């Protein structure tokens with residue numbers, strides 16, 4: 358039974374005792390998983406001491422073969438003491454291959470604990486009506502079964518399809534406007550339309566608006582700009598647009614629709630009153646208290662447009678975690694996304710921090726210093742290098758408050774996509790075999806994030822060893838686009854939040870000219886940063902042709 362003050366007091370005591378809770382949490386993780394051959398092979402059977410001397414830092418790549426066994430249905434103890442109920446398909450890759458992370462019942466408990474904690478602080482500073490609803494733009498369009506018989510989904514999908522999700526969120530959320538059939542629609546574009554319509558149908562009750570990521574909220578209302586008159590028509594007629602073809606979705610939404618020309622008129626008058634859609638969100642939902650979602654890190658570029666739609670509504674930052682697990686909660690919800698920091702929850706894992714040198718404990722980190730995060734938790738992860746670099750902004754009682762700084766080895770990112778030099782090189786090598794058919798080779802390559810388009814897209818620069826046809830180059834272009842298998846990139850391309858990959862072919866001698874540039878001053882950049890004007894200049898002025906992927 359949820360009690361706001363009780364929840365806050367519990368978080369307070371835990372963070373006052375963060376050092377002790379860290380140690381107790383490690384001991385419990387090690388007890389639960391002691392039969393895991395990964396742990397047995399380290400010499401485990403001074404528990405904290407033994408742990409740090411016997412267990413090596415490890416990377417996703419090192420864990421790949423172990424996790425592969427779990428995805429293939431091995432139920433003996435490998436990374437966990439008990440068989441996992443699901444596997445999470447993560448963003449990013451494992452050396453260019455799909456990256457999987459175990460999803461355990463404990464991770465579900467953690468999710469519920471963190472949501473409850475964050476809600477308590479948020480509802481303290483931004484109290485909502487408990488007879489209202491929320492507009493929640495969430496999606497779980499798919500969860501497949503591995504060949505070994507294990508469910509595989511994204512982390513959010515594993516959360517949304519958990520048997521404890523509805524009951525567990527009941528007390529610490531405002532009820533969604535959307536039918537479950539919308540959330541689980543196999544077609545996310547239809548789901549999004551229906552979320553928008555559902556929100557409008559209950560607009561007076563909507564207490565806040567949520568999506569996991571800021572770019573999702575922005576995409577939602579950009580979409581509204583396109584379909585608003587269609588929604589007004591659906592409401593006026595009490596008939597769902599023929600755009601919606603998923604039968605279970607049509608059925609569910611039809612129960613909510615009856616002819617309402619009055620509401621339709623209100624909405625039409627309201628939309629036409631806006632100036633370039635400024636303040637669209639509070640206009641549609643005049644009782645919403647805030648907009649909620651991840652506003653930080655890779656989402657920072659989306660905040661200006663989100664503010665535009667949000668008008669004067671507070672933007673509240675959603676918490677810090679990934680497919681690997683949760684780390685930190687926003688307990689200062691009134692702070693803008695620029696000032697937002699996240700307090701580590703001391704029982705969600707045994708956290709270590711590599712100085713940006715060997716790792717220090719949670720209560721050992723220093724204000725103003727940057728560290729790479731190291732995770733030991735209930736996801737089968739022991740001293741796992743997350744690759745996230747954080748800065749310690751301060752302490753909330755004895756737990757550090759963190760700001761995300763950067764992700765190591767990342768060169769290509771628009772929103773939720775994460776691609777490295779190796780991923781780019783692999784995509785190039787894939788697409789190059791279409792060229793090899795023509796006895797043509799890739800002389801060199803680079804790339805660039807083009808955010809002049811909406812949405813932004815990847816641009817790849819190629820110089821090739823000979824002239825070829827448009828069809829060949831079109832194929833190479835499509836292949837480059839499909840060769841990026843990172844789940845984040847694929848998810849965005851499908852949801853249209855990342856545009857068609859563009860292949861720009863440059864004139865012969867273009868890359869040598871870049872060499873000449875650097876030689877006349879005295880390692881080819883694989884993604885050209887916006888500030889690298891001299892290099893960008895040489896590439897752009899030598900583009901001779903341009904192609905856009907017809908994939909997705």
Ligand SMILES: CC/C=C\C[C@H]1C(=O)CC[C@@H]1CC(=O)N[C@H](C(=O)O)[C@@H](C)CC
Pocket residue numbers: 446447448464465468511512513514516569676677678679680681682683773844845848
């Ligand atoms: C136990 C952890 C449970 C949930 C973590 C996720 C959240 O609910 C908030 C942050 C996080 C987003 C995430 O997992 N994003 C995916 C990813 O980037 O891997 C993406 C492939 C979309 C699902």
